[PDB]
Amino acid sequence: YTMSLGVENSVAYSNNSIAIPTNFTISVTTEILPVSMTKTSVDCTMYICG
């Protein structure tokens, strides 16, 4: 299928109306970031020739 980019949402814009929040949600989200790799060393002479 052709993908849907997002759920449709039409904001009710007018020149004299505002939307004010009456409540809140404390949301905890995860962010995973790699920091380091495995430290590898290769003996070039031993690898090529043994």
């Binding site: 449709e8 949402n9 039409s10 904001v11 939307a19």
Partner: protein, 170 residues
């Protein structure tokens, strides 16, 4: 198509697998880059049919209904100004869907300010949003409200100058 060449090429091992894997990683990385840049909203926002924004004109950046590509005049100008075993993979996001993502971002930032980026889109009049931005940079709301027509005229003139500068500079 040489069988003997491929038989001799098999003696060198998995070089071809490494090169194909690296190219595949680059190819998926480009799609990941496009997702990271443009697909930051999960709601497709749309502008109201009446473009009453207190004097602010966004026709040069909003999508043109007359064009089949549904691009803005600025985006249309940008697209006009950019011109043996190899294959070119198409991008995952086509140009019209990327334009739709930019249109959703424009509609969100015009009708809701920065509220849609942090949660639900909360509607606010655009002059009041501009006044909030003025307060963000340390200028009082009264300055924005008193000089609203001048600010709108300056904004429209600057947007027109941007379109002219893009159309006039190679």
């Amino acid at each position: 198509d040489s069988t003997e060449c491929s038989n001799l090429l098999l003696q060198y091992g998995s070089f071809c697998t490494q090169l194909n894997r690296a190219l595949t990683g680059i190819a998926v990385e480009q799609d990941k880059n496009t997702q990271e840049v443009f697909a930051q909203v999960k709601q497709i926002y749309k502008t109201p049919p009446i473009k009453d924004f207190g004097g602010f004109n966004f026709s040069q950046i909003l999508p043109d209904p007359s064009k089949p590509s549904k691009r803005s005049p600025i985006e249309d100008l940008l697209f006009n100004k950019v011109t043996n075993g190899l294959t070119v993979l198409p991008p995952l996001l086509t140009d019209e869907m990327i334009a739709q993502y930019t249109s959703a971002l424009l509609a969100g930032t015009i009708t809701s300010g920065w509220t849609f980026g942090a949660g639900p889109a909360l509607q606010i009049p655009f002059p009041m949003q501009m006044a909030y931005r003025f307060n963000g940079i340390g200028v009082t709301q009264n300055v924005l409200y008193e000089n609203q027509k001048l600010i709108a005229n300056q904004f429209n003139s600057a947007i027109g100058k941007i379109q002219d500068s893009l159309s006039s500079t190679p």
